[PDB]
UniProtKB/Swiss-Prot annotation, chain A:
Effect of residue 72 to G: No effect on ADP-ribosylation
Stated consequence of mutating residue 65 to D: Phosphomimetic mutant that binds and activates PRKN
Recorded name of the encoding gene: UBB
Record-given protein name: Ubiquitin
Positions bearing the Glycyl lysine isopeptide (Lys-Gly) (interchain with G-Cter in ubiquitin) cross-link: 6, 11, 27, 29, 33, 48, 63
Superkingdom in the source lineage: Eukaryota
Effect listed in the UniProt record for changing residue 65 to A: Prevents phosphorylation in case of mitophagy. Decreased localization of PRKN to mitochondria
Domain Ubiquitin-like: 1-76
Curated annotation (Swiss-Prot), chain B:
Source organism per UniProt: Homo sapiens
Name of the encoding gene: RAD18
Localization per Swiss-Prot or TrEMBL: Nucleus; Cytoplasm, Cytoskeleton, Microtubule organizing center, Centrosome
ZnF bounds (UBZ4-type): 4-31
Chain sites annotated for binding Zn(2+): 7, 10, 22, 26
Quaternary assembly: Homodimer. Interacts with UBE2A and UBE2B, one homodimer binding one molecule of UBE2B. Interacts with SHPRH. Interacts with HLTF. Interacts with SPRTN; leading to enhance chromatin association of RAD18 and RAD18-mediated PCNA ubiquitination and translesion DNA synthesis. Interacts (via C-terminus and phosphorylated form) with SLF1 (via BRCT domains); this interaction is required for efficient repair of UV-induced DNA damage. Interacts with SLF2. Interacts with SMC5; this interaction is increased in a SLF1 or SLF2-dependent manner. Interacts with DNA damage up-regulated protein DDUP.
Residues of the full protein shown: 198 to 240 of 495
Disulfide bond entries: none
Protein's job: E3 ubiquitin-protein ligase involved in postreplication repair of UV-damaged DNA. Postreplication repair functions in gap-filling of a daughter strand on replication of damaged DNA. Associates to the E2 ubiquitin conjugating enzyme UBE2B to form the UBE2B-RAD18 ubiquitin ligase complex involved in mono-ubiquitination of DNA-associated PCNA on 'Lys-164'. Has ssDNA binding activity.
Motif LR motif location, chain numbering: 35-43
Protein family according to the UniProt entry: Belongs to the RAD18 family.
Protein name, entry field: E3 ubiquitin-protein ligase RAD18
Length: 76, 43
């Protein structure tokens, strides 16, 4: 299903992913589009983060949804 | 570089650097409100 992702900066990217696809799989897709490492990217939906070992269908995500992307520079 | 970003969880003005720690706390609350469950009684 076609979904949309919005970064904290305001940028908007349309990403195509299947409910069966895992979150870890989604990050890799982003890597190709945003050129940013999957480890340095964290996604939040409804205020809670998305577990890499979980799938989109498990989060009750329907067609055309807006996800929040945050960047984790370094934990020091 | 100095920048700020709102929190999608609680909506609070916070720098892009302090956001990482903030997310760790903001998310912690979510786990506090929800019921506590333990697979094993010991731990
Ligand atoms: Zn917050």
């Amino acid at each position: 299903m076609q979904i949309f992702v919005k970064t904290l900066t305001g940028k908007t990217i349309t990403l195509e992913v299947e409910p069966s696809d895992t979150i870890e799989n989604v990050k890799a897709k982003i890597q190709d589009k945003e050129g940013i490492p999957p480890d340095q990217q964290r996604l939040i939906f409804a205020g809670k983060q998305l577990e890499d070992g979980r799938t989109l269908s498990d989060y009750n995500i329907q067609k055309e949804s807006t996800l929040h992307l945050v960047l984790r520079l370094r934990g020091g | 570089q100095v920048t700020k970003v709102d929190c999608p969880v609680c909506g609070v003005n916070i720098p892009e650097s302090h956001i990482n720690k903030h997310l760790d706390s903001c998310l912690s609350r979510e786990e506090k409100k929800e019921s506590l469950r333990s697979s094993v009684h010991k731990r």
